[PDB]
Amino acid sequence: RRPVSNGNFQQRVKAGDIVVAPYTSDGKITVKLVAGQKDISSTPDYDY
Amino acid sequence: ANKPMQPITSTANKIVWSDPTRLSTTFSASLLRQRVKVGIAELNNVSGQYVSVYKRPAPKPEGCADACVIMPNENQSIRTVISGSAENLATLKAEWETHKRNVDTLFASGNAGLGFLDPTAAIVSSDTT
Amino acid sequence: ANKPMQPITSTANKIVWSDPTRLSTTFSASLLRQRVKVGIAELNNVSGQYVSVYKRPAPKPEGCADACVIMPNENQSIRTVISGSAENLATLKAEWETHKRNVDTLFASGNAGLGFLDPTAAIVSSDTT
Amino acid sequence: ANKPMQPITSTANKIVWSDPTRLSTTFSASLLRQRVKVGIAELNNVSGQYVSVYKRPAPKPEGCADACVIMPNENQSIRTVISGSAENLATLKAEWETHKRNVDTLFASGNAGLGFLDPTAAIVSSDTT
Amino acid sequence: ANKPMQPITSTANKIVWSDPTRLSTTFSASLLRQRVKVGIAELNNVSGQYVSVYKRPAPKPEGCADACVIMPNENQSIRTVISGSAENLATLKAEWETHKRNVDTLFASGNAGLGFLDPTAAIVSSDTT
C-alpha cells in the first residue's frame, strides 16, 4: 500500500475544495504450477 | 565516543530517544507528512520538529572542585523545525547546511549566546555565486 | 563562501537580513533575555530564535510549460530556537554540535526529509564516555 | 520446556502477549514513567504493572469422568506492580529477589493461599549483616 | 545473613512485619476470602495482597562519600495479589512460579526497569510440552 494523507482534507472539503490523491490498495498476486505427466512414448497395443 | 540513546516512544511519526544512564537527556524527532495545495500544483509537505533537551546542573561557582555539592539543574531546550517539499529535499539540504553556518558564525563563533547580537557579523546565503 | 546578504532592519532585539539580488531569502535573529531563579541564585536565560526563509518555486511540470509561466513559490523555512543559561554557554555550544550530528545522522545523511523515521538511526548525546 | 508465546498487541506503554495454542492465558505488562522532586532533586520514577491471567476450569469433584466437563470456567489472576526510582535499579533488583522468597515463604512453603496467616513465618529483609 | 523481620500489627486479615533496626522497611500481607457459587460447584476464592515497601535514600552524587550528606528518601514498593480458587492452589504455584521467571526475564535480566520495553523478550507460559 502507498497511502497518502491530504493535509487538512476535512477542513478543505468543509471550505468546499475538492481533493484528489493517488492510492494503491494492498494486492495479491499468485501463480499455480501444476505438475503434469507427459506420454513421452506409447506404441504397443492389445485388444479387449 | 558518546553514549548512544535508545528509543522510548517508538511511533510511526514520533521517536523519542533517551540516555539509559541519564533519563533526563532526551532527543525526540517529530515528523508530519502532508499533501498540500499551494497553486496550480500539488506538493507534499514534510515537517520535522527536532528538539533535544538536557537538564544541565547549575555552573559550579568559582574554582572549587569540592565533591558532594548538588545544585539545581536547569533545562537546555534546542528545537528546530523543517518545512519543505520532498521533491525539493536535495535543495533543502543546502539550505539546512547554510543555515548551520549562518547560526554558528552568529552563535557558536559569535557571542549571541551571551545576548550580544552583532549587526556587522557577516553571514552567507544558500545559492553559490 | 557564496553571495553574502546585507542587513535590512537592525534592532537591539531583532536583526533581519536579505540578499540584495533576491530580497525573498531572509535570515531573522531575535533574542529574549530573562532572569531565571534556579535556586538560591539568579541566572540569565536567553531565547535565541533564528529563522531562515526562502521562496522556492514548484518543480516544472515535466518541462511542458516552461517559458515564463511561473508557478507560485513554496515555503522553505527553517526555524531554530536555543534557550539556556548564559553561564553554561560553553557546554551549551558542545550540545549544539551533537544536535547537528543527531539531526544530520537521520535527516541530512538519512531519508527523514522524505519522512520515514529510522528507529535504528544512531543517535548519541553530548556527554562523552 | 514451556510453551513460549509471542506479543499480540504492542504500544509505547502497553505490550500484550498471548499463547497461540491457548489464547486465554496472557502476560500483559504495562509501564509508566514519571519524574519527581523529593530532595529538590530530580528522580525518574518508573512504574511497572505486570499482569498474568489464566483460565483453567478443573475443580473436578472426586473421581468422575465422561460427562463432567459441564463445570464452569474460573479465573486466575496474578498481578505485580513494581515502582521506584530508575537511578536505584541495581539496589531495587535486590528488593525484587528478596520480595520473591518472602512471599514464597507465605505462599509456596506456607498455605496462605488457602486463606491462612502464619505470624510465626520467617520473613527476612533485603538488608544483610 | 539478611536481617529478619517479626510482626508489628496483627489483624483478622492483615499482618505486617517490620525490622527492629530500621522501622522504615515493612512487609504486609492482607487476605480476603469469599464464597463463590457456580453451576453445581462451590469455589473458595482467596485474594492475597502482598506489599513490600522500603524507604531507600536518594542516590548520593558520584565521586564522593565524605562526611555524611543526607540525601532524601524515596519509597520502593513491590506489591502483588494472588487471586484464585483454593482447591487448585497446588497447581497454581507453578503459574506463580512462571510469573517469577516471566517477570525476571523482562525486568531483572532485561533493562525494562529503566523503561525499555522489549517486544522480543523470550517469555513462556505455565503449561509445558
From TrEMBL, chain A:
It comes from the Viruses. Transmembrane segments: none annotated. It is found in: Virion. Belongs to the Leviviricetes maturation protein family. This is Maturation protein. The chain holds residues 99 to 146 of 534 of the full protein.
From TrEMBL, chains B, C, D, E:
Keywords: Capsid protein, Virion. The keyword RNA-binding does not apply. Residues 15-129 form the AP205 coat protein domain. GO terms for cellular component: viral capsid. This is Coat protein. It comes from Acinetobacter phage AP205.
